[PDB]
Structures are given as C-alpha cells and as structure tokens.
Amino acid sequence: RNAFYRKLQNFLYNVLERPRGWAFIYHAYVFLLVFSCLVLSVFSTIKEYEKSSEGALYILEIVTIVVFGVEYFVRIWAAGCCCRYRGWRGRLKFARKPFCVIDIMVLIASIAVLASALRSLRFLQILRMIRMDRRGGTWKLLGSVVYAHSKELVTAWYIGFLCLILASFLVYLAEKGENDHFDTYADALWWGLITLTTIGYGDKYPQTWNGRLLAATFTLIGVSFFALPAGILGSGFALKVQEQHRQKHFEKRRNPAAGLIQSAWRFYATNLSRTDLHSTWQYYERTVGLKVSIRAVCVMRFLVSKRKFKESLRPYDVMDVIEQYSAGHLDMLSRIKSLQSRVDQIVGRGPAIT
Amino acid sequence: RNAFYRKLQNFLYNVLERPRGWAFIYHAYVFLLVFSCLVLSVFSTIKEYEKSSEGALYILEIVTIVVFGVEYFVRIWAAGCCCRYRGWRGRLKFARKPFCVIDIMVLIASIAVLASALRSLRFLQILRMIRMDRRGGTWKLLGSVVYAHSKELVTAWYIGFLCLILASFLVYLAEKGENDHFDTYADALWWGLITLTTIGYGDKYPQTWNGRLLAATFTLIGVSFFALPAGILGSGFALKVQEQHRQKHFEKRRNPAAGLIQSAWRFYATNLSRTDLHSTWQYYERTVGLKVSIRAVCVMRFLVSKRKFKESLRPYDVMDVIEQYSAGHLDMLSRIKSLQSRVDQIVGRGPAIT
Amino acid sequence: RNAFYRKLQNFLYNVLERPRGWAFIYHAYVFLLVFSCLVLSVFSTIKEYEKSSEGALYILEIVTIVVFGVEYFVRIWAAGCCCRYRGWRGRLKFARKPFCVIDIMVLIASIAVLASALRSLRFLQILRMIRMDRRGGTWKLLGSVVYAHSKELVTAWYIGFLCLILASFLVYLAEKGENDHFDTYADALWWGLITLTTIGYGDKYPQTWNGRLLAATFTLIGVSFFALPAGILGSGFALKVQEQHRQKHFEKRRNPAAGLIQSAWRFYATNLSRTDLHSTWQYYERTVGLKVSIRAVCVMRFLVSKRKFKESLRPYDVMDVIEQYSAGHLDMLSRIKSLQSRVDQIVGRGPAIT
Amino acid sequence: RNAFYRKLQNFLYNVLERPRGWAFIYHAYVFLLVFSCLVLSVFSTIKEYEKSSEGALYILEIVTIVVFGVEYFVRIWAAGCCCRYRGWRGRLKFARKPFCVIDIMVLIASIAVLASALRSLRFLQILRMIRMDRRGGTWKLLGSVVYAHSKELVTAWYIGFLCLILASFLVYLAEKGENDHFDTYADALWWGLITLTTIGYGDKYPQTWNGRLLAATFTLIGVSFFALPAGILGSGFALKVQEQHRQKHFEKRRNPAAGLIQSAWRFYATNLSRTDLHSTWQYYERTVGLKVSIRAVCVMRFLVSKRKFKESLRPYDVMDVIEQYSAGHLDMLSRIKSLQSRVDQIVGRGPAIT
Amino acid sequence: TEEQIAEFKEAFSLFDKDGDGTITTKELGTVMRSLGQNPTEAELQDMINEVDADGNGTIDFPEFLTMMARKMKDTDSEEEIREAFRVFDKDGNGYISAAELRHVMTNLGEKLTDEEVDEMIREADIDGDGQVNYEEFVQMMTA
Amino acid sequence: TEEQIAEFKEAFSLFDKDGDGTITTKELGTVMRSLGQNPTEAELQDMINEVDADGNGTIDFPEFLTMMARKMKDTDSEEEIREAFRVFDKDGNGYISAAELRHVMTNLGEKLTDEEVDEMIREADIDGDGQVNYEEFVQMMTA
Amino acid sequence: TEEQIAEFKEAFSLFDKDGDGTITTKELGTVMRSLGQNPTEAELQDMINEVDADGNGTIDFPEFLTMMARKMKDTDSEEEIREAFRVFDKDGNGYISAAELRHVMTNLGEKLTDEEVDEMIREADIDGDGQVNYEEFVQMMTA
Amino acid sequence: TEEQIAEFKEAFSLFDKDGDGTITTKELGTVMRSLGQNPTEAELQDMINEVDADGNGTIDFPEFLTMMARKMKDTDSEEEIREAFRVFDKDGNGYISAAELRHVMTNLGEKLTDEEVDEMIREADIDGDGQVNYEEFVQMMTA
C-alpha cells in the first residue's frame, strides 16, 4: 500500500519527467490538445466561422486549463519521490525551480483571464507551446550547434550583411527616382532583404535596367550567402546528434563495466577452496550444499555480466576500436620489452655457460 | 518443355518482381506509359485542346488498363515459381498480399469507371502512380531517414513552428488595422507560412514599417529553420544509402565465404594419399585416372574460390580493415603469449642445465 | 629550327588542350570574349540601345569568328605533335573526332550566317558556350554524381512528384470554381510546380480557405522534397571531387615508384667492386676517375629519388596509412612466425643437448 | 610606472589587435554603435520620421567619429609595444600598413564631410562596416573555401549558366509575341535569373502554355543548380573550420613539447650525484640544502610538464592516433628485428656449444 | 573429482527440485528468489542460454558440471576486466584511486556492500597505496 | 616423382584430348560437363587464367604439374579460411554451432551434400562438442 | 638512505617553514619566488595535486621522500620525450638539426639560457654531428 | 681506405674543377651535362641539399667521402622499395609479372634502357619464373 504508493509516485514522476514509452504518447496527446486549442483560436479570429469556433474553443480551453492544473498538482506532489526533494518542504523547494515558476505564472494568468482578452489568450497559447518542451533539449541542441560552428555562421552573416547593405544601396542609387518602389533607402533595404532571402514578394522590384543588372549581380551572391546558414546549421545538427549518441553509448558502456567488475569480484570471492572469503558469502546469506549453490549462482552471474559487457564493447566508431586496440598494443609492447629483457638475460648467461 | 515452362515462369517472376537489367527498362516503359496517360488527362482538362486530348486519352487509357490486367494475371500465374507459393492455392495465397489487394481494387475501379468521372479517373491515376514503386523502397528509405534523424527533425520543426507562430502573431498585431491583408489571424498565419517557406506569393505582405521590421527580423530565422529539414533529410538519405551499400557488400562477402569453405573442404577431402575420403568422391561420382582428374578439378575450384573470396575481402571502409587487422592482432597476441611461455620454459630449464 | 618547330607545336598543343598555367588565362580570356559577345547580343535585342549595341556587336563577332577559325586551324595543325596523330593524314584523323565535328559545324554555320538571323546567331552563341568546356569534365562529374546517388535522387523525385500531383489535384478540387486561377487542372499543376519549387510567382495562389489549408499542409512536404535534390547533388559533387583527388594522388605516387626503382637498380648496378655491371655503365657512357663519378651521380640520383618517393607516401587518408601499416603488419606477422619456428627449433634441440 | 606604462601599452595593443575576452565585448560594442549609426541613417532617409532620426543621428555620428579617432590614435601609439615597431619611427612604419591607410582615409573623409552629403555618408558607413573585420579572417576563409572546392563551384556555375541561358532563350522564343513580359531577350534573361534563383518576383512569368511547359522543365534543373553553390560553400566552410582547428590543436601540441623537453633536460641536468651539471644550476642561481631544493623544484616542474604534454596528446582525430601508434609500431618492428638478430646469434652459437 | 561430483549432484538436486536432471528456468528462478533476489524471466532465459549447449532451454548434468568446473583462467576474463577498469579509469594512467571504487562499486549496476569493497581493496591494495593498478589486479585475479 | 609424373600424364591426356600438350578451355569445359557440371565460359577463362602462367590461354605440362603439386600449405589458405569462418561467425566468440554449418554449407554457393557435411563435422568435431572453433579447424586442415 | 633522508629533511624544513610537516601551497610559492620565479596559484595547485596522494592539498613527508626518490626511469618518460621531439621533427627522418633546438629550446615555453642548450648539444652531439637523433637522446636520458 | 680516399680525391677534383674543396652547384651541373644529362637548377639544389650537411650550398670533402662510403644498408631502402613495388603490384599477391616491369621500367620517370631491364630481370629472375616477388628482391638488393 504505502510501498505501492511510493512506487506509483516514482512512476508518475518518471512519466511527467523525461519519459521513455507510453508517457511519450501521453505528452504527444497533451501537445495535440494544446495545438487543437490554438487552431480553434485561429478559427475564432475568423469572422464568418466565429460562432462555432468560439463555441468549441471555450470547452477545449476549459479542458486545457483543468489538465494543466492537475498536471502541475501531480508534478509537485510526486516531486517527493526524488531523494533531492522529499516531503512538503521538498515539494515546495522543487517548485522553486524557474520552470515551475513559469508554469505557475502561466496557470494563474489563464485562470485570471478565464474567471482585449484575445491578445492575452494568444500570448498565453504561445507561452504554453514554448513550455511544451519541458527540457530545453531542442534549445540546448540549437545553442550548442551555433556555438560549435560560430566561425562559419559569423563569416556567413558578415558576408551576407555586407552583400545586403551594398546591393540595397546600389539599387537605391540606381532606382532612386525612376521607380516609386525605392523612394527611400529603407524601402530599398527592405527589398534587398526580401530578395536575398529569395522570398521575392514582388511588391518591390527594380525596373531601371542598370538597377536590374546591379541587382542580378549582387543577389546571386546574396542568395548564396543567405542560404548558407541553413545548411551550416543542418550539418551542425547532424554532428551534435552524433556526438550525443556517442556519449550515450559510452555511458551505456560505463554501467556494465561496474556490473562485470562486481560480479567478477564476487565470484573470485566465492571460491570454495580459498579462505577469508566470508566477507562475500555474508552478503548472499543476508539476501537469504548452499555454499556450492551460491558459487554456482555467482559464477553464472559473472558469465552473463561478462557477455553483456562484451556486447557492450561495440566499436560504434573507428576511434573506439583504435583506442581499444592501442591499449592492447601498448600491452603487447610491454610484453615484447619483457621478452627482450629475458633474451638479454639468456645471452648474458651465454658467457657464463660457454 | 515443362522444365522450360518452369524456367520461363521463374524468369517472368524475377522480371515482374525486383529486376536487374532489361526488366528495369520494361518497368521504365510501363511507368512512362502511365505518365503519358496522366499528361493526356491533364491536357483533356484543358478546354481549347480537350478534343484531341480526350481522343488520344481514351485509347491510351484502354492500353493502360489492358496492360495492367495482363500484368496482374501473369504476376499471379508466375507466383507459383517461388517455393513459398505453388499451385493455384499458392497463387491465391500470394494474391492475399496487401499489395496485390491494392492492385486488384485499382483494376476493378478502373474497369467499373470505363465500362463526375474525371474525379475518379484522376484519383485512380494517382493511386496507380503510387503503386508504381512495387517495393516501398523509396518509402522505407524515407521513413528510415526520418526515424534515424528524429531529434534533428523534431528540433527543427519545433523551432520553426514557434518562429512561424510568433512572427505571424507579431505581424498581425502590427498590421491588424492598417493593412487589409491581415484582417484576421488566419490570414496572418497563412502569410507567415508562405513567407518562412520563401514561396512569397505576394498576395499578402506587411506595409506598416513596424510590421515590416518585425517581419524581417523573424523571417530571417524562420527561413533558416524552414530550410533546415531539407538539408537534414538530404544528409540522412546519403547516410542511409551508404549503410545499405555496406550491408549489401557484407552479404556479397557472406556467400563467397560459404563457397570457399565448401571448395576447401572438398579439396582437402579429395587428397589421393589420405583415406576415408570416399564421402566426398561419391558426390562427384554421382555428378558423373578419373581420381586424379577429380582432385585436379576440385583443387582448381578451391583456388578460384580462394581468389574470388579474397577479392571479396575488399576494405570498403576503415572499420572493415581495422576489424580484420584486429582479429589478426589478437592472433598475434596469442602467438606472442605462446612464445612468452616458451621463453619462460627455456629460462626455467636454464637452472636445470646450468 | 625544325626541332624548335616541333617544340613549339607541342607547346601549342598543350596550351590548346588541357592547360595548366598561362594557357588557362588565355582560355579565360577567349571565354570572356564570347561572354561579351553574348552580352552585346542581349543589348542588341534591347530596342532603345539597339544602335550602339549592334554597332559594337558586329565587330566583336568578327573578332570572335576569326579567333575561332585560327584556333581551330592551329589545333588541327598541332594535332601532329601527339604520337597518335602525325602528318596531314594524322591531323585529318584527329579532326574526325566528334568534338572537332561540333566545332567545324559551328564555324561553318557562323560563317554562313555572317556572309530570322537573330535566332540562328543566338543559337550559335549557345552552342559555342557549350563547346567552351573542351573536355566534358563538368558533364562527366555531374553524370557520375547522378549515377552514384541514383537511389537518393530517384526516391526524392518520386516522393516530390507524388507530392506535386497530389497537392495540385487537391487544390484544384478545393479551388475549382471559387478561384479563377485554377479553372483547369493544368493551371493547378503549374501552380503546384511554381509553389513547391518556392518560386512563388504570385500569378496563381489559393484563396478558398480549405484550399489554402490543403496547400499549406502539402507544400511543406513539397518544398522540402524539391529542395532535397540540390543538397544531394552538392554532397555528391564534394564526394566525387574527393575521390578524383585521391586517384590523382595515387598516380602521383605511381610515377615516383618507378623513378625510385629505376635509380635504385642503377645505383645497385654501379657498385665498383661488383662485376658484370657493364650493362648499366654502358647507358651512362652512351649519355657521355669517371667510374667513381658515375657511381657518385647514380647514388645521388637514388637518394634524391628515395626522398621524393618517401615524400610522395603522404597518408592523405586513414585508409592509406591503414593499408600501408597493415602490409607492414603482415611482414611483422611473418617475421614473428619465423621466430616462432626458430624457438621451436631451439626447444627441439633442448632434448638433444640436455 | 614606466614598466607599468609598457605593460598597459602591451595590454592595449592586444585588446585593439586580436582580442580574447572582454576586448571582444568592447569590439562588439563599437560594432553595435556603428550598426546603430547605420540604422539611424536609414531612418533619416525616411521622410515622416526624418526629424528625430537626424537629431539622434548627428550626435551618434559625432560619438562614432570621436571613438574612431581616439581608437586609431591609441592603436598607433601602442604599435610601439611589438618588437617589430618601436618609437615614433616604428609607429609610423606600422601606420604604413595598408589597413591603417584604409582607416586614416576613412577618418579624413568623415572629418571633411562633417566639418549630396547623404551619398558620401552612406558610402563611408559601408566602408567602416567592411573595416570592422580587422583581420580578413572571414574573407580568407571564404576565399580558401572557394579555392578548395573550385571544381564543384565551377561545374555548378557552368551548368547553371547554361541552364539560365537556354531556358531564357527558349521561353523568349515561346513568349516573344503573346506575352508583353518578354518583349526583349534582356527581359527574358532577367526573368530566367529571377526564376532560377527562386526569387520569383512575379513581375514577369510565362503565360503561353508551351512557354509555361518549357519553363517548368528547365527551371527544375535551374533551381537545383542555382541552389548547389550554397550547399557546396556550407560544406566547404565546415571542412575548412575543421582543418583550422586541427592546425591550432597541433600548435597547442608544439609548445608543450618544448616545455617538456626543457624541463626534462633541466632535471636531467640537476642530478646531485652527476657532476659537470653547473651549467644548469647557474641559471637557477641567477634567478635567485639549496641544491636539493633546486633538484626537487626542477623534477616537480618536469613532472607537471610531462602531464601537461601528455594531455596535450589528445587523439582529436583518427589520423592523429594512427600516426602516433604507427610511429610506435615502427619502434616495435625495430625491436623485433633486433630480437631476430639476437636469436640468430643464439642459433649460430648453437653449433659452437653443441 | 568423485567427491566434487557428489557435491555437484547435491547442488543439482538443490536446483532440480523435480529431479528430472534438467534445471528448469522456473526452478532456477524459484531458488534464486529463495536466496533473496528477483530476476526477470528474460534474464533467466539469457543466463540459461549462456550455459545451455544443447539448445533445450535447460541444462543436463554434463553441461552443469562443465559450467561449475570452468575456472576463471579458461574463461579468459583478462581482456574484459582490463577494458572495464580502463573504462572506469578516467585518466588513462593505469591506476585508479580508492574512493572512485568505493563509489562506483557501490552505486552502479549490482551495488556491492561495504564488506565486499573492503576485501576488494584488501586484495587490491597489496602495496597499500590506494591507487591500485587495475591491470595488476586482474592479473592477480587470474592466478 | 616418376609414378606421380606418369599419373600426371594420364590426367593430362584425359584432359588434353587433342594430345597437343596444351589444355584448351573447351577441352576443360567438355571434361567438366562429362563429370556432370556446367560452368560458364567466362568462369573457365577465370580458372585457366588462375592456373595460366605463360599468358597463352592454355596450360603446358610444366604449369599443370606445378598446379597439381601445389599442396595447400604453399597456397597459404590459413588467413582466408579464418576470415571466411569469422564472416560466418555471428558472435565473434571464435566458435560456431554445428546447426549453422549444417544449414549454410548446404544452402550457399556450391551447396554440399549430407555426406560431405557429415565428414566435415567428423574431422572438425574432434572434441565432439559441435561448437567447433574454425581456428583450430583451419590449422588441422593445414596439417 | 639515512643521509639522503637527512638531506630530504633539510629540504622539507627549507620548504615547510612552519615546520608542521605539510608543505603549504603558499610556502611552496614563497620559496619559489625566493628562487626568482613567480608561479600562478592554479599552477601551484596543479603541482601539489600532481605530488599529492592523500588529497589534502599539502604533502606529508612520506610523499615528499617518494618524490625525491622517484628516478626518471620509473617515471617512464621514454615515450613522452620521443613524441615531443617527433613533434619538433618536421621531417620524420628521426633526427633534428642543431639550429632548430638552438631556436625552439630558447624561445618556446620555459625558455632556457645559452649554457643550458650548450650542455644539451654536448650530451646530444656525442657523435659530433649536430643532426642529433632524438631517439638515442631520450634513451641516454633513460640511462 | 687510403686507396678509396685517393679515388674519392680524384672524383672530387673531377667535380671541384676550381679545386677549392667545395663542389659548386654550377660545377655539378656542368659535369652532369658533360655526362650527357641536363638537370634543373632547382633539381641540383635539392640534390645538394640532400647531401649538404653544413647548410653552405656546397659540399666539403668530409661530406663527399661520407656520401661515397654510405652503402645502401645504412640508407635503409628496404621499406621504400617494398612499398614502391607494392604500388606497382596491382594485385596485392606479392609478385609482379615480367611484362609489367618491361613496360613501366622503360616508360615512367627516368626510363631505363633494354640492357638495364635485362640485367634487372637477370638478378630478379633468380628462380627464372618471371612473376618475381618484389619483397625477396629488395632483400637480395640489401645483401
């Protein structure tokens, strides 16, 4: 009961915190509900459909707010599972986290609005959408990629900004009077930005042939350099995901290493002939003919742990195999050095026996 | 005759199933015929050219439907070649496959339409075009790439969706009254989607200078993140094709390994001096001075298999060579350990002889 | 004179064929002249500037045609340098090459036009521009990249074509009557192509809200998959250039290997003490106290060749070093096997001397 | 004081030259001030906001010019820190650098203008923005990437230029009369450029169905090849940044190698028993029971240097570890060769002792 | 040996409660939880498969005696233990500080008790240094 | 030896039906299909080239006797067979279960009959374990 | 030995001015700047940590005597010195010209004086060549 | 030896026409074209730099006698020749057919004459096989 209560509290905390399986589907569903609420708000802003749009929006929003409130309640309550926070004091201390602060301010804003409203409602939709991530994983990945490729992004931005400024100014000079699109440098710069991005709205475009020619020559380079950052970020995303997977692989290696060492020590400390081993047998006795059975169990555990650790030593990379084999090769170098010393001793004895 | 009939059935099954050479050209031609039928339907929808367009479309579509019917017939009939399905019962059992179900419903729908029609005809064209792949290879590749790079795609989608929502809402606030393009938030969201994608139709664009400025600052990031997924998917496509090629290379290695082992055993089991080898000579006798000839042919087979397998051990990758050389290095470690034991024995004897 | 004539013929053939240095600048200049001729043709097509544009174009085109004629003459004449083609017969045989056929038909077409003309002149400009490449290197690279990544390109094309067809048809259904942009399926297909490519002219766009929504949902995927092939081709271009550089590196290795082997044999065959070496000394005598000098120059050549070849064994790749070191490791395995045999012999003698 | 003056001169020179920490923030702030000056110029060009825009612009520009003048003064004055340039003569010699010429001409142009002006002011804004880089690092990176991938870029440009020319000419032929967008080949070529780049302004587009079809078939390829160079440059940027990081890593290796060798020699030259070591003890004496203290300090320095150098031997790359391990494997080969010769000696003695 | 074989039969009977000569996965699980540990059915399947040689899902007595008799020497655990300790060796120096073992040994996987880690350091700190060389440690384990 | 060379001449005559001293590719194909197997012409070129040393498309008697006399040791099949079995070893344990051989040997490339695989396991299951190690197997093949 | 122990006690007293038996980081820094060189507090922390074995931030006398007694052989500087000289070997030939040492040794990291490089070349130019091999050079440091 | 020293002095005089004891790159080039071959100025520069040890642009007699006395063994050309032949070995079998040498030896780099390649095959075809192994061949060059 109480133990079951603690088990369920831990499971709920895991689900609400970083989940693995069906809790992932639950999070997908809550996100989908928020998304549908946002879509209904969109349709409410439409006039001809406003009636049914708002009719459904009110009930969907009440569902969303009750779900948010109960979710925050259960999150705070289950905060006691972790050893870091326990009890009511621990739950409050967990609530002191900035993310919980964000969630609670959003909740109170929603309850105040519900119990010019469209502006606040749409804002709060956006903030809850932001909150959906719950870990900053996407934001952390994006920031890490930006920092890693800082030089490429900075050079691309500098070159593209120079291209934008120069092209806009030259076109403005070329089309200052003839075309009413470029009456002011601000308009020309807006045109330059809309062109180099390849959006090309068409509300502003050069018509003077000198202006058209300058625009052509500059927007070639401009569109190239405005497209650069997207590709740079894509490559960086791929690289950073690869690195994160490598780290996860190495931690998945780290744990079975402990498992294998533990089982190996226990088995080496369960040999029947060897004495002074009671320090190990006592553990199993506390867990509880029997001695040989315990040795059998321990050796069985050691072999399974060995196999699991071995299959945990997957290459996963050229670097990995190279490193493991280089450790082996250093061992081999030491062995051949020892054998060199032994043959040196043999040749030194040579004079003695000759 | 009957053996030739089975041979032709197998060849037809191979052609209709995954082909290699000229059957590839036949599939290209049937796809081209369907493509021309679709183009002629397009031209039929055009009014001024409707006459000749439909005149040719009717005959091209009759050709297409007869080709589809006969192709399905021969596919079902040749389904008996494979050991999985044989006989009329086997052909029906193969016909229960979902893909055959798709093809047959398409066939019956087309025949019913032939013997509001444009809607159904165009739908049927689209479904047959989908059916052209015949293996889901493109779909499987796309799904595998999406799953493999799930994190990068998800972060890109999340960031870009936030950028779209935020930019649309901010512009809508900035251009709510002044510009008639953004009378409703739905219009603003459509503009945001058309801009961040860089389509830039031009039917909606900001004109209020605050709106223009906000749009510029947000669509920079928006277009970057909307372009991300294309690059991510391109890189993932390349990676997955590389991995599939690696697997195919390793299976091309797997088969010659069996070939070499078989030939090597046979030759080692065809030695003239060695006895008890009749278990091997009997195989060649069943295939049928002659003994030495059998040994000659067997050793010739072994040598050709050896060279073929060796050329099949192409590096193809750093990981591959590293793995093979690491197996060799473990062998070398064992050898040096044995030689360490031998020198240990010699130095232990030293005292005996000294 | 005659020897100088042949030297200049070879130099001219090299310049006109694949050049390295200043001939590269000459080809750049001839290309620039053709480009300026095309630009002047463009300006001639303009009306208000037609006068001076045509005035300069006529003289620039006379210069271009005379340059083309003289260059073809010199190429044909210098074709005799290569051992493949010599003499007037050899030059004609070289002229039989298809590329020379392209050049000659272009020359005669230009001379006929010069001595509805705008159509032919612009065509001829385009064909000569095509001819500028002179080696198909760009075309060969593009074709090789397409073939290498055939699967990624094919899946991208299939998925994007399905997206285009489906989105166009769905929008046409949604916007058949309300919007006059999509009066026919052909118009809808043109809109789909202009949108998925992100060109977005703006002459056609959905206005019905259901049509707008369908278009948004489908053009997301459509633009992604229409952008795919560009990235795929960029990556393939990089990869193929890398592979070509690898092959060039290995040929740059191949030649110095022969150089080193030659010099090493000569030096080993110029040893003063060793006899029967006259077969080597005779070569230097034919080139012509002196014997020691011959040995000195020969060994000097060998050492410089060794240094150059060693410098030519740059890694350039992990594969390269791994391959070289694995060869060396095979020698090491053989040596340790020999030492294993020698220790086996020693331990076998042990019984004899014990 | 004077020593402190030199220290501050060196600190200021480092800050103004390539900085590391807070000087980076100072440069960011000066760049931001210039950027805000440019923004205020933009707003001044706007009419309705001209008053306050120019009111703030004048004061911000006076701040900018005084900052530029004082910064150049301090840079010239601190130029004496470096051993290359010292004294007034040295500072002038440093001022002979072309970059200082750019800065000084910009300064005098600004002072002349301040004490048709909009054209010059905007120009000088652009040149100062260019000058912000201070090292050409972005330009050097871009040029290096272009040169490295010269072949891919050249093939992409050639193919795309051919596509542009051909598509424009074909559309012009198709839309010469029916559509007034393409009255001249120059207009058609402008359309081709604006389309293949996917800008798609919408001011020109085909309307004749044959023209639309040709345009579709050609702009597919055209947009692909116009997008190519952006991806090529992105990949090249990533590669070049990686290579530069590799070089920086190897220099960070180069310095600790010297540190370790120095400390190792000094400790090896501070052994108490060994004589003739005063050549090392004298250096510490010049820096200044004490002898053992000196030995302890020197060995401590050696151990710390050894550790730092070892952590400076990070793999950082497969090639790196392969290089180090291949060196070690060469030593291993030499050792096994020595042992081969030694066991050869033993077997040769065998006959002697047998 | 004969007395060893008798002890082996005693152990087999202790496991093979049915006495059919084949240890069932459920028999193994029951005895395991009798000793005070709960495995997973899949975990029991993995272990039995590891020891299984006839592909029957159980163990005949010959396989059982071969499994007990498998001394660690033939197991060839040298490389695996070297690699594991190296994984836990964050420095690459070839050693590891005592506190690191005291923590990881007792906080990862099947956490060990204080007495076990104490005897671990006892047999590892033969030099009484604490910065035990894991390589020498696995060497002494093998012997 | 002399008796061996006489047997070699008998074999050469059995192949070189023309008796011209050079085995034709077509002669080799004819004798092969007499033995009951159909090769491909290109396969015949590949094998003859393998044995060919004079670049003539045939084999004079010296090359033929060298081909027969080449014992497996000088062929140096150790590494190749090691690698092949390793390819078929999905575990990397250095062994392979019998059923895997029974399946693959009889279903890949030139599938072998039951008798051949039976003698294979006979000479490989010297320990009678079934989980035969390919390493010692190729060593015993060498000797 | 006993006399070496007394010398180490004199050194410890010279370092441990307080005489508490533990060399403080500040005591080490003070003596260091007395010899005429200023470290960084973090640098001193790194050194003490290197020599520290009890994780106390200071050094008890046992660790101190171990530090003095640690001959370079047990330090195993062969590979490290080899690799460093290799890094400075821009050719890979296995040698290095004298001028390169005269420059780098005196201009990188802790630049040394002329006399130091002179004795360096003296003990390096045993062959009197100038193009000293770093390999033999580190070897004769070992001996 | 003394007679070898006299022969080297004769060679130096033949080279050092000026008789100043230092061979000029112009002197070397003149004698070279006297032998009937033209180098490039840079080529002579690289040659002399290779033999140069004093960084002077010439060769004093000690360096010259060192160059004469430098037998190929101290040069350690084993690995280089092995690798070169491997590069020309398109198969990786460890051998190479005669015709390949006859072609490449006479058409790459410093093309060799018929006589030189004939003595090449003579000393390489010790077994008279034609498919000479480059490894044993460089070994015999060494000895």
Ligand SMILES: C#CCN(Cc1ccc(F)cc1)c1cc(C)c(NC(=O)OC)c(C)c1
């Ligand atoms: C980044 C960004 C925007 N999003 C996320 C988004 C989610 C919900 C929306 F209603 C709108 C947008 C986005 C972007 C692209 C290119 C695609 N297409 C694609 O992935 O092709 C492979 C998709 C499917 C979504």
Ligand SMILES: C#CCN(Cc1ccc(F)cc1)c1cc(C)c(NC(=O)OC)c(C)c1
């Ligand atoms: C994805 C997608 C659309 N398709 C497939 C398609 C097939 C038939 C059609 F009628 C229309 C489209 C497509 C896309 C691009 C970018 C190109 N251009 C290219 O590959 O340049 C390298 C091509 C040639 C086809």
